[PDB]
């Protein structure tokens, strides 16, 4: 049929990935959203992923200035691998934050459990260190679960972050382990546990006492991913010990996860696309009459 | 003292941090730590009267988009900020801005418009364009630069200025 | 480093049954590179790479729960996830130099 239409995964000689990476600059930064949907789902669908992988993040880390800029945006790049945190990976992070979730929420949430500790919000009738002390109970707790979900780790989410861990060792040798989990923490596991709900782990949003808590304990969460501290906000120090004390642990399990199976796309009118950006794809530069060839006889809808 | 909750939105990288901090703290922050959410407070005098300023400073990665309901629902004052080197970010106020009149369901809401890293030599949004599209929203623009602090004072003074305004 | 010997790095194949050499001599050495700041938290490793190259043969990451298996004198091998790799040194002098390397490696972990 004219499914060879869906062959933009051509594979250029010692290289790799032409119409993609001209489409990839192309393309209004409006869809990207949607970019980063439709090649992912294509090029899995092929076997073809980690090659998609492997052009997107390194033309990603060739451009950066430095190490601690890689991934921190929202580029084409960046959106790829969002995406693939989120189909690979979400049912992983539902069933691994739901019981916790529901620890909290249910059998927590009534002895006016209260996690404010920025002592300007802090209600007269609360105290700042039983309130530290919940923050850091939840977090724990948090922390330690996931440390411990090695094992339940979906392969397809470690062959991303074993794909974007060699990506950037080719540039950054030293610690190049810790773009890989800072990534992962600041755009696929904080976000869910932000906004539960919203990421579809919960039924309705928590109690606003626990919203604000998973709130700042997330900011926790991604000091100790960075191994940074706290520096900005004055009455975040007061966990510094807390976060100073977990950084290893966190790497030994981002270690683990970058070392060493879907459907198909649905009814995928990949011509929209193609075709609405048919005028600037020639001028950027061999192949496009092939394609030009194509659509000349499939009519755009 | 009268409180000014001051929100500080736009796209991810623009400054919004090292705007804030300059204000805060008053130094350049040359690192790029994305941030989830934070908050801080200054007491200042504005054409004679001093007040203190509830600051928010906003995640600009989409990722936690999810967020964005809750400060624009309690926040008076928003803080649109765009980097004059990356027009994607400067259309990506509009979409701050209709989230901000929908919560609030109201169309004057005091905002104002920032374009930050005035310092860079390669601008992508001239002037003319952010005035323009300013003169379209009704509210004021500021040129700055978190790096050489101009204009951070003048863009955080002119926002209460327009809550002011808004109270009368 | 921690350690700087001229030894020889072997592996183990099943199937051949005992160590064979993993084929040239090489400096193997052991060393740390921090996490941040030069004095604070780091990963320590083993790295060993020829002299007839100077191209790495063998690179491990250090664990506290490393077993360390001196089995022999200028003889020792250890057991990193699901392979099997050790040296074989000179002299007994440096079998202990290179072991006082990795004692103290691990003491600094942390
Ligand atoms: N040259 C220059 N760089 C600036 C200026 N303002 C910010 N930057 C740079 O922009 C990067 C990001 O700044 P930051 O304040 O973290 O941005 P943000 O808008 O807070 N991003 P996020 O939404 O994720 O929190 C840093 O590299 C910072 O140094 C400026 O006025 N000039
Ligand atoms: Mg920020
Ligand atoms: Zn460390």
């Not at chain 1, 600059?25 to 294509?42: F, G, H, I, M």
């Not at chain 2, 919560?103 to 104002?112: G, I, L, N």
Request: aromatic residues 10%; hydrophobic residues 40%.
């Amino acid at each position: 049929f004219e499914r060879l239409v869906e062959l933009v995964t051509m594979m250029g000689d010692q290289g790799e990935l032409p119409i993609a990476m001209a489409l990839a600059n192309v393309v209004p930064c409006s869809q990207w959203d949607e970019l980063a949907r439709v090649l992912v789902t294509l090029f899995d669908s092929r076997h073809l992923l980690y090659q998609l992988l492997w052009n997107m993040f390194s033309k990603e880390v060739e451009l950066a200035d430095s190490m601690q800029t890689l991934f921190r945006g929202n580029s084409l790049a960046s959106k790829i691998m969002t995406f693939c945190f989120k189909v690979y990976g979400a049912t992983y992070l539902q069933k691994l934050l739901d019981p916790l979730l529901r620890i909290v929420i249910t059998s927590s949430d009534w002895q006016h459990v209260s996690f404010e500790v920025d002592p300007t919000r802090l209600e007269p009738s609360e105290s700042l260190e039983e309130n530290q002390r919940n923050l850091l109970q939840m977090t724990e707790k948090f922390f330690h679960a996931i440390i411990s979900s090695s094992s339940e780790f979906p392969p397809q989410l470690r062959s991303v972050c074993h794909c974007l861990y060699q990506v950037v060792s080719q540039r950054f040798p030293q610690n190049s382990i810790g773009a890989v989990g800072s990534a992962m923490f600041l755009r696929f596991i904080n976000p869910a546990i932000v906004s539960p709900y919203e990421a579809g782990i919960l039924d309705k949003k928590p109690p606003p006492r626990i919203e604000r808590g998973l709130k700042l304990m997330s900011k926790i969460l991604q000091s100790i991913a960075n191994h940074v501290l706290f520096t900005k906000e004055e009455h975040m120090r007061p966990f510094n010990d807390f976060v100073k004390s977990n950084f290893d642990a966190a790497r030994r399990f981002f270690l683990d996860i970058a070392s060493d199976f879907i459907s198909d796309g649905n009814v995928l009118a990949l011509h929209r696309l193609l075709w609405n950006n048919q005028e600037k794809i020639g001028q950027y530069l061999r192949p496009f009459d092939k394609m030009a060839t194509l659509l000349a006889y499939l009519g755009p809808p | 003292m009268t409180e000014y909750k001051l929100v500080v939105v736009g796209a991810g990288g623009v400054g919004k941090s090292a705007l804030t901090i300059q204000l805060i703290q008053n130094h350049f922050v040359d690192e790029y730590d994305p941030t989830i959410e934070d908050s801080y407070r200054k007491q200042v005098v504005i054409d004679g009267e001093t007040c203190l300023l509830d600051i928010l400073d906003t995640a600009g990665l989409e990722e936690y988009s999810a967020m964005r309901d809750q400060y624009m629902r309690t926040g008076e004052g928003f803080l649109c900020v765009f980097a004059i080197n990356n027009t994607k970010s400067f259309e990506d106020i509009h979409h701050y801005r209709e989230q901000i009149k929908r919560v609030k369901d109201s169309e004057d809401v005091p905002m104002v418009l920032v374009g930050n890293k005035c310092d860079l030599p390669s601008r992508t949004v001239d002037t003319k364009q952010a005035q323009d599209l300013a003169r379209s929203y009704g509210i004021p623009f500021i040129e700055t630069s978190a790096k050489t602090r101009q204009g951070v004072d003048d863009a955080f003074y002119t926002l209460v200025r327009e809550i002011r305004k808004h109270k009368e | 480093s921690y350690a700087r010997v001229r030894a020889v790095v072997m592996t183990r194949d099943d199937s051949s049954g005992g160590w064979l050499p993993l084929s040239g001599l090489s400096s193997v050495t052991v060393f740390k590179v921090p996490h941040q700041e030069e004095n604070g938290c780091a990963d320590f490793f083993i790295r060993g790479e020829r002299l007839r190259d100077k191209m790495v043969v063998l690179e491990c990451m250090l664990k506290k729960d490393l077993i360390y298996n001196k089995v022999t004198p200028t003889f020792h091998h250890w057991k990193i996830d699901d392979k099997k790799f050790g040296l074989t040194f000179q002299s007994p002098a440096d079998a202990r130099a290179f072991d006082r390397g990795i004692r103290r490696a691990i003491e600094d972990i942390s």
